[PDB]
Amino acid sequence: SMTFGQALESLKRGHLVARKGWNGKGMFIFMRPEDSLPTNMIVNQVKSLPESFKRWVANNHGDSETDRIKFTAYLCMKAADGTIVNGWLASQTDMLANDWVIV
Amino acid sequence: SMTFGQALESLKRGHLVARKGWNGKGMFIFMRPEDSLPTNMIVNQVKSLPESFKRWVANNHGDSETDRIKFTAYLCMKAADGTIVNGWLASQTDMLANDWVIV
Amino acid sequence: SMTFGQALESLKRGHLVARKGWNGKGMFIFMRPEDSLPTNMIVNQVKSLPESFKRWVANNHGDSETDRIKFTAYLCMKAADGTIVNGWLASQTDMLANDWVIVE
Amino acid sequence: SMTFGQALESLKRGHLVARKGWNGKGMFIFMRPEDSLPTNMIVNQVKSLPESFKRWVANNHGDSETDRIKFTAYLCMKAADGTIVNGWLASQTDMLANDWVIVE
Ligand SMILES: Nc1nc2c(ncn2[C@@H]2O[C@@H]3COP(=O)(O)O[C@H]4[C@@H](O)[C@H](n5cnc6c(=O)[nH]c(N)nc65)O[C@@H]4COP(=O)(O)O[C@H]3[C@H]2O)c(=O)[nH]1
Ligand SMILES: Nc1nc2c(ncn2[C@@H]2O[C@@H]3COP(=O)(O)O[C@H]4[C@@H](O)[C@H](n5cnc6c(=O)[nH]c(N)nc65)O[C@@H]4COP(=O)(O)O[C@H]3[C@H]2O)c(=O)[nH]1
Ligand SMILES: Nc1ncnc2c1ncn2[C@@H]1O[C@@H]2COP(=O)(O)OP(=O)(O)OC[C@H]3O[C@@H](O[C@@H]1[C@@H]2O)[C@H](O)[C@@H]3O
Ligand SMILES: Nc1ncnc2c1ncn2[C@@H]1O[C@@H]2COP(=O)(O)OP(=O)(O)OC[C@H]3O[C@@H](O[C@@H]1[C@@H]2O)[C@H](O)[C@@H]3O
């Protein structure tokens, strides 16, 4: 029986959480961790980034091996249809509710 | 310092809080309390409701004085230019940060 | 058959909208208009604001009846249980979907 | 001179956009594409997923190569400090503003 703050602390430590009051059933959220990536790994090896961004990186940072760019950790959801939503966001209700549970 | 969860519990108790790492300076968030409002007061009293809502409420809930609709608590922000942003939303960075302070 | 951008334009013009793909049924969103409010009203007469805020306003702006503070427009939801959630949030799915429809 | 809806259409088409009225400077948002990934890859190959999720996938989608899971597209922000914020959020101000601009 938890607040959003305890759910967040639980997420930071790599757990799965959910709210009883959600409309969809069988969902949970989780954290994806932070990582620092070499810039030329971004420009040349990463499939999941748009070309526009890769071009901007090349333009403003370049191909130095030393240079690395940090990707922040963030929340994701296993939604009701079984898809993974990157970037889960907390509604006002999620934030002030106290019906969070560990899954 | 403080996590977002402690900031949330602190907001539930009516305090103003803010993050050091925010781009704009001099800001803070606070909570607007929850309230239950009569359908009469909704259809006929409130300036801040669109007609479409007032009409939806009329065609549904009706004239009963007893009928009430709960308007929920929610977060608001005193922004850098001094405007009050209703319905402040927490970014991923905000949620995972531990640089919250009581204001 | 609308995008989120078209749905937002409908909202700005005072309509109710919804996504077919939402889990909860019978929900919709609407926009609550912006307003400029007198500093005195906020500090002395507004029931829905917390005291910490009323105290901050008083220190920051004295009440002259000409000093006004702007409260922004924002989106709200009639939720599945019939309560009104102020401050509705658009999920990544909400934002990228094209299953928006107008509700009456 | 753009609404959030136009900025979103531009994002879905691979452009970088930003708001004039943001406090931080030099920031922009972009979309990360959706992809469908086989279960076996998720459990055994992807490192940027927590172990509890990989286990859930193993327990639920099984050991099959047949099963695939869809990872949705989503918005990301290049922040004022040059870090890439995954899962960028549209504030009430963002969604109702008409000061969006294409940056690349
Ligand atoms: N745009 C905007 N205007 C604001 C805001 N806060 C206050 N106002 C204005 O201040 C008036 C009086 O506010 P009140 O004393 O809280 O008196 C309010 C309040 O007690 C109640 N009410 C309406 N919606 C809500 C809500 O979401 N939450 C709560 N707690 N009360 C609400 O209805 C009463 C009458 O509402 P109105 O006729 O609209 O009259 C409102 C509206 O003209 C705001 O954040 N944005
Ligand atoms: N569309 C999509 N595909 C996904 C997603 N999660 C995993 N994948 C796929 O799984 C591949 C391997 O992921 P990885 O082992 O984490 O290997 C990744 C990961 O180590 C890293 N990476 C890139 N962006 C990020 C990020 O934002 N955060 C983290 N933590 N790592 C990232 O770069 C490596 C190579 O990236 P890719 O070439 O994209 O290669 C990714 C992409 O093929 C997702 O949410 N969406
Ligand atoms: N596919 C998806 N992508 C991103 N987020 C998703 C999602 N499915 C569920 N969520 C989120 O998970 C919590 C409740 O889940 P639900 O109660 O099942 O939500 P739903 O009834 O569909 O309403 C939807 C409304 O809820 C809000 O986001 C919810 C909310 O934080 C958001 O404001 C949306 O407009
Ligand atoms: N007028 C306003 N109305 C609503 N919310 C506002 C706001 N001013 C600031 N915020 C929010 O407050 C926190 C940090 O504040 P900032 O660091 O000043 O953010 P900013 O650089 O303006 O970028 C803006 C980006 O940050 C995120 O919203 C921020 C973020 O939650 C969101 O993703 C947006 O795209």
PDB file of C-alpha atoms and ligand atoms in Angstrom, chain B residues 32-37 41-42 44-49 54 70-74 76 84 86, chain C residues 32-37 41-42 45-49 54 70-74 76 84-86, ligand 1:
ATOM      1  CA  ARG B  32      -4.844  22.871  -5.642  1.00  0.00           C
ATOM      2  CA  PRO B  33      -7.094  21.003  -3.206  1.00  0.00           C
ATOM      3  CA  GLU B  34      -9.857  18.621  -4.167  1.00  0.00           C
ATOM      4  CA  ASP B  35     -13.524  19.626  -3.990  1.00  0.00           C
ATOM      5  CA  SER B  36     -16.999  18.262  -4.709  1.00  0.00           C
ATOM      6  CA  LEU B  37     -19.267  20.614  -6.623  1.00  0.00           C
ATOM      7  CA  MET B  41     -23.313  25.054  -9.398  1.00  0.00           C
ATOM      8  CA  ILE B  42     -21.571  23.422 -12.377  1.00  0.00           C
ATOM      9  CA  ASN B  44     -25.149  27.618 -13.669  1.00  0.00           C
ATOM     10  CA  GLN B  45     -22.374  28.992 -11.382  1.00  0.00           C
ATOM     11  CA  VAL B  46     -18.940  28.331 -12.818  1.00  0.00           C
ATOM     12  CA  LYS B  47     -17.230  30.799 -15.118  1.00  0.00           C
ATOM     13  CA  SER B  48     -14.311  28.458 -15.786  1.00  0.00           C
ATOM     14  CA  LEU B  49     -16.188  25.674 -17.480  1.00  0.00           C
ATOM     15  CA  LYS B  54     -22.003  22.415 -18.766  1.00  0.00           C
ATOM     16  CA  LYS B  70     -15.747  15.555  -7.726  1.00  0.00           C
ATOM     17  CA  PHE B  71     -13.124  17.842  -9.136  1.00  0.00           C
ATOM     18  CA  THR B  72      -9.786  16.438  -8.221  1.00  0.00           C
ATOM     19  CA  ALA B  73      -6.708  17.802  -6.576  1.00  0.00           C
ATOM     20  CA  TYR B  74      -3.890  18.710  -8.921  1.00  0.00           C
ATOM     21  CA  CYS B  76       0.118  23.953 -10.325  1.00  0.00           C
ATOM     22  CA  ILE B  84       0.207  30.273 -12.823  1.00  0.00           C
ATOM     23  CA  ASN B  86      -2.629  24.939 -13.975  1.00  0.00           C
TER      24      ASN B  86
ATOM     25  CA  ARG C  32     -10.818  25.127 -19.133  1.00  0.00           C
ATOM     26  CA  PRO C  33     -10.306  28.738 -20.228  1.00  0.00           C
ATOM     27  CA  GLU C  34      -7.588  31.131 -19.126  1.00  0.00           C
ATOM     28  CA  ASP C  35      -8.314  34.063 -16.815  1.00  0.00           C
ATOM     29  CA  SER C  36      -6.600  37.057 -15.272  1.00  0.00           C
ATOM     30  CA  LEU C  37      -7.457  37.422 -11.649  1.00  0.00           C
ATOM     31  CA  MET C  41      -9.337  38.142  -4.969  1.00  0.00           C
ATOM     32  CA  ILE C  42      -6.750  35.457  -4.866  1.00  0.00           C
ATOM     33  CA  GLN C  45     -11.495  35.474  -1.630  1.00  0.00           C
ATOM     34  CA  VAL C  46     -10.456  32.413  -3.573  1.00  0.00           C
ATOM     35  CA  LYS C  47     -11.462  29.199  -1.830  1.00  0.00           C
ATOM     36  CA  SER C  48      -9.536  26.832  -4.097  1.00  0.00           C
ATOM     37  CA  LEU C  49      -5.988  27.997  -3.500  1.00  0.00           C
ATOM     38  CA  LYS C  54      -1.848  33.050  -0.873  1.00  0.00           C
ATOM     39  CA  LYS C  70      -2.803  35.111 -15.044  1.00  0.00           C
ATOM     40  CA  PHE C  71      -4.024  31.571 -14.653  1.00  0.00           C
ATOM     41  CA  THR C  72      -3.497  29.557 -17.790  1.00  0.00           C
ATOM     42  CA  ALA C  73      -5.940  27.514 -19.793  1.00  0.00           C
ATOM     43  CA  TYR C  74      -5.516  23.770 -19.395  1.00  0.00           C
ATOM     44  CA  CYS C  76      -9.347  18.411 -18.067  1.00  0.00           C
ATOM     45  CA  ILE C  84     -13.248  15.595 -13.305  1.00  0.00           C
ATOM     46  CA  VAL C  85      -9.497  15.324 -13.315  1.00  0.00           C
ATOM     47  CA  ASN C  86      -7.974  18.705 -13.727  1.00  0.00           C
TER      48      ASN C  86
HETATM   49  N1  LIG E   1      -9.203  30.199 -15.176  1.00  0.00           N
HETATM   50  C1  LIG E   1      -9.157  30.076 -13.839  1.00  0.00           C
HETATM   51  N2  LIG E   1     -10.007  30.767 -13.078  1.00  0.00           N
HETATM   52  C2  LIG E   1      -9.817  30.524 -11.758  1.00  0.00           C
HETATM   53  C3  LIG E   1      -8.893  29.687 -11.165  1.00  0.00           C
HETATM   54  N3  LIG E   1      -9.015  29.701  -9.783  1.00  0.00           N
HETATM   55  C4  LIG E   1      -9.998  30.539  -9.560  1.00  0.00           C
HETATM   56  N4  LIG E   1     -10.532  31.069 -10.702  1.00  0.00           N
HETATM   57  C5  LIG E   1     -11.627  32.037 -10.706  1.00  0.00           C
HETATM   58  O1  LIG E   1     -11.904  32.373  -9.348  1.00  0.00           O
HETATM   59  C6  LIG E   1     -13.312  32.184  -9.110  1.00  0.00           C
HETATM   60  C7  LIG E   1     -13.547  31.852  -7.657  1.00  0.00           C
HETATM   61  O2  LIG E   1     -12.726  30.726  -7.281  1.00  0.00           O
HETATM   62  P1  LIG E   1     -13.120  29.949  -5.937  1.00  0.00           P
HETATM   63  O3  LIG E   1     -13.300  30.922  -4.821  1.00  0.00           O
HETATM   64  O4  LIG E   1     -12.121  28.855  -5.764  1.00  0.00           O
HETATM   65  O5  LIG E   1     -14.561  29.356  -6.329  1.00  0.00           O
HETATM   66  C8  LIG E   1     -14.690  28.290  -7.260  1.00  0.00           C
HETATM   67  C9  LIG E   1     -14.299  26.943  -6.649  1.00  0.00           C
HETATM   68  O6  LIG E   1     -14.719  26.901  -5.302  1.00  0.00           O
HETATM   69  C10 LIG E   1     -15.140  25.962  -7.470  1.00  0.00           C
HETATM   70  N5  LIG E   1     -14.372  25.156  -8.420  1.00  0.00           N
HETATM   71  C11 LIG E   1     -14.507  25.068  -9.783  1.00  0.00           C
HETATM   72  N6  LIG E   1     -13.660  24.242 -10.345  1.00  0.00           N
HETATM   73  C12 LIG E   1     -12.917  23.745  -9.281  1.00  0.00           C
HETATM   74  C13 LIG E   1     -11.851  22.813  -9.275  1.00  0.00           C
HETATM   75  O7  LIG E   1     -11.341  22.228 -10.244  1.00  0.00           O
HETATM   76  N7  LIG E   1     -11.366  22.600  -7.986  1.00  0.00           N
HETATM   77  C14 LIG E   1     -11.852  23.195  -6.842  1.00  0.00           C
HETATM   78  N8  LIG E   1     -11.269  22.854  -5.677  1.00  0.00           N
HETATM   79  N9  LIG E   1     -12.856  24.070  -6.843  1.00  0.00           N
HETATM   80  C15 LIG E   1     -13.335  24.299  -8.092  1.00  0.00           C
HETATM   81  O8  LIG E   1     -16.146  26.703  -8.163  1.00  0.00           O
HETATM   82  C16 LIG E   1     -16.146  28.046  -7.640  1.00  0.00           C
HETATM   83  C17 LIG E   1     -16.663  28.986  -8.698  1.00  0.00           C
HETATM   84  O9  LIG E   1     -15.826  28.856  -9.881  1.00  0.00           O
HETATM   85  P2  LIG E   1     -15.925  29.977 -11.011  1.00  0.00           P
HETATM   86  O10 LIG E   1     -17.355  30.349 -11.198  1.00  0.00           O
HETATM   87  O11 LIG E   1     -15.143  29.533 -12.196  1.00  0.00           O
HETATM   88  O12 LIG E   1     -15.128  31.189 -10.325  1.00  0.00           O
HETATM   89  C18 LIG E   1     -13.724  31.124 -10.124  1.00  0.00           C
HETATM   90  C19 LIG E   1     -12.937  31.585 -11.348  1.00  0.00           C
HETATM   91  O13 LIG E   1     -13.565  32.736 -11.866  1.00  0.00           O
HETATM   92  C20 LIG E   1      -7.994  28.960 -11.981  1.00  0.00           C
HETATM   93  O14 LIG E   1      -7.109  28.166 -11.615  1.00  0.00           O
HETATM   94  N10 LIG E   1      -8.206  29.220 -13.332  1.00  0.00           N
END
